[PDB]
Amino acid sequence: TLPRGSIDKYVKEMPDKTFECLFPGCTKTFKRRYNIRSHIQTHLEDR
Ligand SMILES: [Zn+2]
């Protein structure tokens, strides 16, 4: 009754100011920011 352990199961935060969405099928990398996290929402939101 509380989903909150999948958004942090596919994120590779790099100390070089980078990000690697570890989602299976995904292939987009971002930088030090909390925007890709919301991107993981559309990941398991409907697609
Ligand atoms: Zn992704």
Swiss-Prot record:
It is found in: Nucleus; Cytoplasm. Cell cycle-dependent phosphorylation of three serine residues prevents SWI5 from entering the nucleus, and it accumulates in the cytoplasm. As a consequence of CDC28 kinase inactivation at the end of anaphase, the three serine residues are dephosphorylated and SWI5 enters the nucleus to activate transcription. It is then rapidly degraded. Threonine phosphorylation also seems to occur. Phosphorylated by PHO85. Transmembrane segments: none annotated. A zinc finger (C2H2-type) spans 19-43. Determines the mother-cell-specific transcription of the HO endonuclease gene that is responsible for the initiation of mating-type switching in yeast. Recognizes a specific sequence in the promoter of the HO gene. Activates EGT2 transcription in a concentration-dependent manner. Synthesized during G2 and early mitosis. Present with 688 molecules/cell in log phase SD medium. This is Transcriptional factor SWI5. The chain holds residues 532 to 578 of 709 of the full protein.
